[PDB]
Amino acid sequence: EYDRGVNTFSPEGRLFQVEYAIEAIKLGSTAIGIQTSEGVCLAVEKRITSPLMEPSSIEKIVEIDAHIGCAMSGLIADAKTLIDKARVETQNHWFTYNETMTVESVTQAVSNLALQFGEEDADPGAMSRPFGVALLFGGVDEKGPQLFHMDPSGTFVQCDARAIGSASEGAQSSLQEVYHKSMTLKEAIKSSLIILKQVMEEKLNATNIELATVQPGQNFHMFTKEELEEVIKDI
């Protein structure tokens, strides 16, 4: 309703719009990121809605830069502006400093947009509402592999393993049950796919999920259907 401005605090000290946007996150398809010493693995349920749809057109994991990928959950159309800002940020950083932006810096630059919405004293081009999407930025910088979570409130945090989206509760509990700091990238990929298979409704197969990894050696890499098939076979 319009009884309140978008910048109205609740009596409990929270912005109404941000809390509603978080509620919106809780309707997205489930994504899971796991950070290990050998790299970061991102996975996301595609949620095919019709067999006439082309699963390849569902892009839930995108490349921010050769060393940074992002998984997203919630209102995916809202994520496009944030993804473009992150990409432009990394390329501006490379242009100015002749070096690669750290995952934390990219996450910070994106999170600085979360609360930049409002109505009065706002020029055209101003956002009228918060973004209804949560992001998992996985990457590899001088500090090794890094996994970061950002939500609509602009708060971002480094995580060892994080689940976002509709089933994030059970997914997070399982991740806590299975994660150890010494696990290998293969172990993390297998565990993430097991958790996704568990929390998903449709049977997990090579077409209805997305899986990417970032490693110190290789750049951001999206698993092909055959690699996905090989990983799924051992589950």
Binding site: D3, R4, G5, N7, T8, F9, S10, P11, E12, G13, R14, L15, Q108, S111, N112, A114, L115, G118, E119, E120, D121, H149, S153, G154, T155, V157, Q158, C159, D160, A161, R162, Q172, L175, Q176, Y179
Partner: protein, 237 residues
């Protein structure tokens, strides 16, 4: 009700409910304590972890060689204010080639955060700050609020359950001036521990420290760098 949705609406009692709600935003945050001696200013922040696998949210930030801050409340507003403060200090060093005195920075913060509390469609900043600084007048602890009021404190604590920390600080403030750095940090840590529940305890993961002084630029200690300060701490009652 009809008085508790906009910052430009006075209630019949002479209050502005939106500002009080932003105060609540601050009161929800995790506790942080600031205190000082004749030579040092210390911030000790209890950091929260949203999940057992997530890193604890950073609560202490750099502003300038002589100024650091601890934040409690909305972290995006905290980042906005920190960026503004950093730019102010940079402007001072650029124009006058001298560090910005802490009190003047606090006054600028006050003006900046008061402006939106009077304009339709704007909201108060939802963050409280503890500001530790050192300048020609010595060390300083300041507390800034969403109401745009600021206070110059011998010691302060803000955030959830910070009343216990304030009780400890009121009890022990007589000793802070003649404390060495280690005793000062230990007092800060005991005050912060008073905010903790019985089950929780101070560790090297959920504690961060910030120290500034005459010959010490503002330094943030995290993780194992906190172990030296925690080592001498006794067991809580």
């Amino acid at each position: 009700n009809q008085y508790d949705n906009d910052v430009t609406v006075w209630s019949p009692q002479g209050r502005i409910h939106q500002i009080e709600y932003a105060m609540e935003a601050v009161k929800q945050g995790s506790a942080t304590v600031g205190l000082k001696s004749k030579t040092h200013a210390v911030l000790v922040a209890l950091k929260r972890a949203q999940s057992e696998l997530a890193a604890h949210q950073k609560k202490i930030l750099h502003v300038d060689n002589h100024i650091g801050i601890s934040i409690a409340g909305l972290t995006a507003d905290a980042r906005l204010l920190c960026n503004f403060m950093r730019q102010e200090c940079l402007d001072s060093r650029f124009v006058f080639d001298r560090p910005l005195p802490v009190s003047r920075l606090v006054s600028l913060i006050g003006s900046k955060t008061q402006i939106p509390t009077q304009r339709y469609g704007r909201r108060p900043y939802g963050v409280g700050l503890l500001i530790a600084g050192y300048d020609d007048m010595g060390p300083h602890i300041f507390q800034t609020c969403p109401s745009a009021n600021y206070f110059d404190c011998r010691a302060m604590s803000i955030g959830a359950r910070s009343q216990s920390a304030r009780t400890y600080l009121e009890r022990h403030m007589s000793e802070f001036m003649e404390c060495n750095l280690n005793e000062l940090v230990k007092h800060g840590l005991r005050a912060l521990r008073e905010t903790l529940p019985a089950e929780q305890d101070l560790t090297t993961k959920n504690v961060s420290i910030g120290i500034v002084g005459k010959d010490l630029e503002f330094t943030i200690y995290d993780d194992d760098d906190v172990s030296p300060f925690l080592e001498g701490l006794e067991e809580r009652p």
